[PDB]
């Protein structure tokens, strides 16, 4: 099915009906007027964050180079791989840009504390995908530019998910969802799963251990917010 989608909905409502059941939802009318959603350009961020070295996931493998090369190399004119400014903690190394976001106030209702939730950035050209997987905290993933193709298996369906047998990579499925080897992995076939795309301004819930793959179906940037 589709995730539901609630404007502003209460914090009793999103408490009893989504966080304490773990059920995915998308939250509209709550970070469509963050800053971000209208200053965040490709010439904003080279003016904001050019200089600085990110990470990027090129494919395998891991490098580093500026923010200026990631746009250079894999965002415009013509790419010649698939790279992704992935799972980095921009708002820490840049606070200027930390200006453009808030906290979610739904967050309120965890049992961390605020100091400690990790808010990651996700910039990226079309086609990055991140495979399916579970994460050990509760998720709002915030979509700023481009969309998404997101896909959710509850944990129940773990075990027609056939996670890698590393304790290291036991949190990733081995399956590739939008074209499952069905003769390797033949429970994957039946096992039910919700999707969406997630567009600006729109903020998905993804339940703590919720699987998850995503695919930008454009340029993109999101902003995740993991927390407690
Ligand atoms: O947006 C992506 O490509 C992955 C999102 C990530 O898994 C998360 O935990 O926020
Ligand atoms: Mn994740």
């Not at 961390?112 to 990055?128: K, R």
């Amino acid at each position: 099915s589709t995730v539901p989608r609630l404007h502003r909905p209460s914090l009793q409502h999103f408490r009893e009906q989504f966080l304490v059941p773990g059920r995915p939802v998308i939250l509209k009318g709550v970070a469509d007027h963050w800053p971000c959603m209208q200053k965040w350009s490709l010439e904003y961020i080279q003016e904001i964050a050019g200089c600085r070295t990110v990470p990027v996931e090129v494919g395998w493998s891991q490098t580093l180079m500026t923010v200026n090369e990631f746009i250079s190399k894999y965002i415009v004119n013509e790419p010649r791989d698939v790279g992704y400014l992935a799972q980095h903690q921009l708002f820490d190394q840049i606070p200027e840009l930390k200006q453009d976001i808030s906290i979610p106030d739904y967050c309120s209702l965890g049992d961390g504390e605020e100091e400690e939730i990790t808010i990651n950035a996700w910039f990226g050209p079309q086609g990055t995908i991140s495979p399916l997987h579970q994460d050990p905290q509760q998720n709002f993933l915030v979509q700023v530019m481009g969309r998404k193709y997101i896909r959710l298996y509850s944990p129940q369906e773990s075990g027609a998910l056939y996670p890698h047998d590393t304790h290291l990579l036991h949190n990733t499925s081995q399956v590739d969802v939008e074209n499952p080897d069905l003769e390797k992995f033949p429970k994957f076939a039946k096992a039910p799963f919700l999707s969406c795309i997630l567009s600006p301004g729109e903020i998905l819930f993804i339940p703590v251990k919720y699987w998850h793959y995503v695919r930008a179906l454009d340029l993109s940037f999101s902003v995740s917010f993991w927390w407690s």
